[PDB]
């Protein structure tokens, strides 16, 4: 297959953020890592001044600013999710800004199990080494001897396999590492001394001590305090050896501290951010001993206020704090000495859009002008909302809960949105905050006799699921229908069935209990939104979870656990089973094109079924026999089937004489997107390339996949090969390595996919670069103008 | 959350490829039974089964019928194709099989004083290595595809380099008067090997010390297996419970027992299960397949995590695919059992029993 992939909207979620003197020794810089993008801003008193953005051939998993001796300004260490490590310097000569790679190399190990807690990257305060935790039982050390041509990275064995967190201690003669780990006894904090000469670990300055059962964060307090702060779920402790200081502030009991940042350079104040957007200040009181060093007296935690759910925090200047968020919009807030009428010391200054995570989306023509618009379910928890995107203008409709599915009814002029809100079983389940499902003009509650014939507790967070009918013009929540207790709504479709001239909202729901591996009960509920009221037209009970549903030529095609079922809408308004297909583990995703059905499985890739009108049954037309974990499937056309798998890869299969080979779906295209694709849809935001498929990912990235002809694909592949030899990659990563299909099982180069971002970068290069890129290319000898026209035509698609 | 809908929601919300391993681990942890399936195509007892390296895409099996069959697990499960019979058959029972690092070749040996190196891509015999007695063990060096170890009944553990086959001079790593029953390279340290001997127990050997074993754990051992990281040894003994050793301790870290388990009348094999090898699998003479969980806190572990029933005769070989959390077991009967936490076409049983 021949396909073309571009990004209509670059990733918006903030994966990391650091502050330091990167562009110059004088100005203060904020560096934000957004998956593959790296944004450099200069912190001025007028706000944030963007100074640069660089694309990265990799997912930035670690980003640390450090400055060894002899450097005028900080260097930047980046490790990618594919284990490309690089040390970068920012040089600005005249009016030309460029990022120079000072060091680069791959630190992947042939063997090793990636850690459950993830990749950890730390740098010694004196810049003696870089410590990486990539696999259980090993700790990689990269020496930082600049007067050398080779940085010899080596592994050191860890007696503790499950390390929770790790930092480098301050004010140590030899590089000391303090980490919280777990063993059958519980969680412990321990310290080692990293010996480069012997390449090993020696006894730490202070002995291990038992920490909280849920201790998860380690903070290395700078001088003069020294030591470490262990933050868990119920208490905050401070360790410096003979000195131990614990506090148990009740305020932090209602959530988990997830991020931290150091405000004062001497460690006096820290900013802490938890999972529900609360911002705290951790204080460290000091006492000056007589003719001696200062020592900690106490720890005080005060609730600064409420922000967006922070993935990371960074204090910029004059009380300004940047809150980088994954599940909501990023933010610049101000810390005020005096609280407001609500007792909040945080006032929002600026907000930065974040469409991620895009869990579902639809393409609708609301203005009826022939140009499509994308309505996406973005965010989660209080940060969840609807995003309306047009040609790139974005409008936000806050929901204050998690939206799951969205489907548009043109006849009713409305949207049906499945939403979820967290509630506490405070005696039933009361609330957590006002949201869309609780502030609807009208509301209703499910009254179903089924499932009446599973324990609870006083404190338990439970999901309450609602179907919201939302007007398409004002986007007000016209109606909210609440489903049964412990019932999760997983799928939502809007269609007309059979000979019935009415348009319905069909919801598939599963009875979810934490103790069960898979649901044993579920419902398909058909509502009709008529004259402002949402009545339950029909209700069908199924023995499983209705993961997906589509309309199949006037019939309902549902996925109940591992079965793909086809129902028909009877004259008496009742779904009747027509046929079943059982050869699945779990049919998560369903698509359709005529009589063909593309079934996505949890771990067995894609399957192609065909409905037999003359036989009234299914048949397995083809199956893809490479087992990979699927997140989304799409039918590009009758022949090609696109799919996305959980390791950030896209693959295109084809319906390939002997009957055995005809029943195999050959993976004719492979690509490493670097994004977790949640949703696929057919449509375009604008009105060589045939077709148009928009996909939405977890990082708030919207991408476009189209089909190419053989000649166009050949020309663009030649252009890619010629560009890779001209475009200077940041970190010196090979584009071929970056785009290679990567999985824990197998790794292969990309085939049948054109990186449209690389192609569109061809317009931004200098004229000499353009001319030497197109040299002896293909026919009439192509010049720069022809390829410029081709690339502009390609760009016109989005 | 143990339910799968919670896992799907979390994965779609965070999009990290680390919730999959947690989901599969938690699914296996809560199982009280496994989905059962059969594989047909062998005319006699199956004596050797091996999953292909780096994914378990293929399953190479061999036994009394003298044929080396190569099952495509995905296609075989859906009953789409029949096993590929590699060209080149043994003259007697096949006792051991092995892949190389890449699954580009297959070593097969046993009972005919011969080890045949096949090419799986074209299913053609590539090489032959003669032995003085029946071969029971085959291990391929994890670093070098051209180096492989073999244990024979005469009591010799030899190291062959196929790269210099025509001038056959096997390097004898060990020589004892008793029959060596198992040999395995260390997955992370190729210079270290583990050998199971009929009258000398379990031994740890160095490739640079061709006569003195580094360590002697404990003596009668029929099978010894390293874990994925090569820091533990699981050993099966002629009339004793399975025993787990640390690579350095020399003393039994654990022993595993359960009511009804017995290992006396057939040469069996064991394996580790789970993503971090926290499970012990072993067949028994009562036709059941026992699965224990290695205690996290360190000596007899009584009570199996699972007692998988369904085999009509003694269970000898057990192998585990961690990418799919699949179990392939074989024994005297000519059918190969498949046990999965997930449903497969034409299964039996469930996850609750």
């Amino acid at each position: 297959s021949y396909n073309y992939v571009v990004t209509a909207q670059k990733p918006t979620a903030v994966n990391g953020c650091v502050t330091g003197h990167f562009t110059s020794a004088e100005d203060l810089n904020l560096l934000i890592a957004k998956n593959t993008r790296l944004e450099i801003y200069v912190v001025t008193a007028e706000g944030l001044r963007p100074v640069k953005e660089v694309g990265m051939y990799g997912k930035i998993a670690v980003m640390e600013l450090f400055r060894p001796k002899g450097e005028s300004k900080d260097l930047l260490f980046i490790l990618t999710a594919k284990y490309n490590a690089c040390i970068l310097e920012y040089k600005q000569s005249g009016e030309s800004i460029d990022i120079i790679t000072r060091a680069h190399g791959n630190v992947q190990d042939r063997i090793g199990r990636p850690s459950e807690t993830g990749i950890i990257g730390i740098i010694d305060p004196e810049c003696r080494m870089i410590g990486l935790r990539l696999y259980d039982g090993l700790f990689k050390v990269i020496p930082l001897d600049r007067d050398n041509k080779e940085l010899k990275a080596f592994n050191i064995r860890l007696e503790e396999l499950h390390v929770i967190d790790v930092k480098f201690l301050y004010g140590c003669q030899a590089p000391t590492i303090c980490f919280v780990y777990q063993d059958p006894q519980g969680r412990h904090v321990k310290t080692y001394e990293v010996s480069l000469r012997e390449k090993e670990f020696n006894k730490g300055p202070w002995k291990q001590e038992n920490v909280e059962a849920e201790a998860s964060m380690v903070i290395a307090v700078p001088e003069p305090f020294g030591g470490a702060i262990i933050i868990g779920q119920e208490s905050i402790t401070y360790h410096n050896g003979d000195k131990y200081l614990a506090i148990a502030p009740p305020i932090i009991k209602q959530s988990t501290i997830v991020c931290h940042n150091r405000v004062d350079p001497n460690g006096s104040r820290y900013l802490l951010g938890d999972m529900e957007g609360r911002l705290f200040m951790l204080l460290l009181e000091k006492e000056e001993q007589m003719d001696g060093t200062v020592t900690l007296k106490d720890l005080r935690v005060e609730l600064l206020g409420e922000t967006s759910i922070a993935e990371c925090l960074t204090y910029l200047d004059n009380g300004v704090v940047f809150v980088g968020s994954r599940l909501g919009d990023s933010q610049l807030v101000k810390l005020n000495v005096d609280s407001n009428e609500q007792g909040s010391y945080v006032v929002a200054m600026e907000t930065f859009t974040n469409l991620g995570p895009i869990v579902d989306m639809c393409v609708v023509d609301l203005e009826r002008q022939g140009q499509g618009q994308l309505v996406t379910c973005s965010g989660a928890f209080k940060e969840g909302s609807l995003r309306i995107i047009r040609n790139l203008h974005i409008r936000t409709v806050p929901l204050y809960e998690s939206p799951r599915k969205i489907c548009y009814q043109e006849v009713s002029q409305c949207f049906g949105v499945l939403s979820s809100r967290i509630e506490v079983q405070d005696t039933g389940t009361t609330a957590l905050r006002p949201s869309a499902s609780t502030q609807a003009l009208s509301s209703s509650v499910s009254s179903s006799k089924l499932f009446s014939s599973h324990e609870t507790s006083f404190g338990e967070e439970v999901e309450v699921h609602n179907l919201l009918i939302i007007d398409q013009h004002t986007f007000e929540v016209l109606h909210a229908h609440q489903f049964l207790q412990n019932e999760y709504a997983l799928s939502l479709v809007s269609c007309k069935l059979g000979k019935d001239p009415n348009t319905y909202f069909i919801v598939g729901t599963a009875m979810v209990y934490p103790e069960e591996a898979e649901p044993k009960q579920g419902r398909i509920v058909v509502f009709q939104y008529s004259d402002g009221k949402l009545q339950t037209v029909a209700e069908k009970e199924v023995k499983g979870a209705v993961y997906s549903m589509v309309e199949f030529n006037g019939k309902l095609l549902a996925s109940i656990n591992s079965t793909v079922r086809l129902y028909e809408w009877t004259t008496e308004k009742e779904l009747r089973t027509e046929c079943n297909h059982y050869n699945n583990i779990m049919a998560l995703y369903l698509k359709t094109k005529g009589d063909f059905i593309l079934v996505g499985d949890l771990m067995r890739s894609v399957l192609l079924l065909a409905y037999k009108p003359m036989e009234g049954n299914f048949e397995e037309i083809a199956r893809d026999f490479n087992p990979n974990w699927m997140s989304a499937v799409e039918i590009l056309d009758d022949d090609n089937f696109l799919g996305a798998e959980n390791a950030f890869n896209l693959f295109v299969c084809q319906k390939d004489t002997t009957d055995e080979e005809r029943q195999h779906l050959q993976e004719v295209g492979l690509f490493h997107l670097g994004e977790f694709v949640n949703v696929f849809c057919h449509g375009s935001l604008v009105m060589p390339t045939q077709g148009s498929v928009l996909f939405g990912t977890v990082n708030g990235m919207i991408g476009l996949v189209t089909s190419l002809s053989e000649s166009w694909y050949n020309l663009l592949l030649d252009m890619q090969n010629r560009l890779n030899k001209v475009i200077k990659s940041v970190g010196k990563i090979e584009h071929s390595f970056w785009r290679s299909f990567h999985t824990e099982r197998k790794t292969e180069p990309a085939t049948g996919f054109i990186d449209g971002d690389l192609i569109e970068s061809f317009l931004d290069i200098s004229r000499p670069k353009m001319q030497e890129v197109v040299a002896n290319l293909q026919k009439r000898e192509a010049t720069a103008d022809d390829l410029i026209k081709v690339v502009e035509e390609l760009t016109r698609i989005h | 959350m143990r339910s799968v809908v919670g896992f799907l929601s979390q994965r779609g919300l965070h999009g990290d490829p680390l919730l999959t391993q947690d989901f599969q681990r938690r699914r296996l942890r809560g199982c009280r039974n496994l989905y059962k399936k059969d594989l047909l195509g062998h005319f006699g007892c199956v004596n050797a089964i091996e999953f292909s390296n780096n994914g378990g895409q293929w399953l190479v099996s061999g036994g009394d019928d003298r044929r080396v069959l190569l099952w495509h697990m995905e296609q075989a499960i859906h009953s789409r194709v029949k096993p590929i019979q590699l060209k080149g058959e043994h003259h007697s029972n096949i006792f051991c099989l092995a892949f190389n690092s890449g699954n580009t070749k297959v070593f097969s040996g046993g009972n005919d004083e011969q080890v045949i190196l096949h090419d799986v891509e074209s299913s053609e015999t590539l090489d032959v290595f003669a032995h003085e007695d029946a071969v029971y063990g085959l291990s391929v060096s994890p670093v070098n595809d051209n180096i492989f170890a073999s244990s024979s009944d005469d009591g010799r553990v030899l190291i062959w380099d196929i790269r210099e086959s025509p001038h056959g001079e096997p390097f004898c790593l060990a020589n004892y008067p008793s029959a060596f029953h198992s040999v395995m390279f260390n997955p992370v340290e190729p210079r270290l090997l583990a050998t199971a001997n009929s009258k000398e127990g379990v031994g740890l050997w160095d490739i640079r010390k061709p006569q003195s074993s580094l360590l002697r754990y404990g003596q009668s051992a029929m099978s010894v297996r390293f874990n994925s990281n090569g820091t533990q040894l699981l050993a099966l003994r002629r009339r004793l419970p399975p025993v787990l050793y640390d690579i350095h301790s020399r003393l039994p870290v654990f022993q595993f027992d359960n009511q009804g388990y017995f290992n006396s009348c057939t040469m069996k094999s064991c394996c580790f299960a789970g993503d971090r090898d926290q499970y012990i699998l072993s067949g028994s003479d009562d036709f059941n397949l026992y699965m224990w969980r290695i205690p996290a806190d360190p000596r007899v572990v009584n009570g199996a995590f699972m007692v998988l029933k369904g085999h009509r005769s003694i269970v000898n070989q057990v192998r585990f695919n961690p990418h799919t959390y699949m179990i392939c077991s074989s024994g005297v009967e000519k059918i190969i059992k498949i046990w999965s936490p997930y449903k497969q076409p034409g299964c039996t049983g469930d996850l609750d029993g």
Partner: peptide
């Protein structure tokens, strides 16, 4: 790039075994 990062191969398991067996000489 003025430097490259190469992970030199080391014998973690053998070093651990040698240290453990030399430690048990009391």
């Amino acid at each position: 790039s003025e430097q490259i990062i190469v992970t030199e191969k080391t014998n973690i398991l053998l070093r651990y075994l040698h240290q453990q067996w030399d430690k048990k000489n009391a």
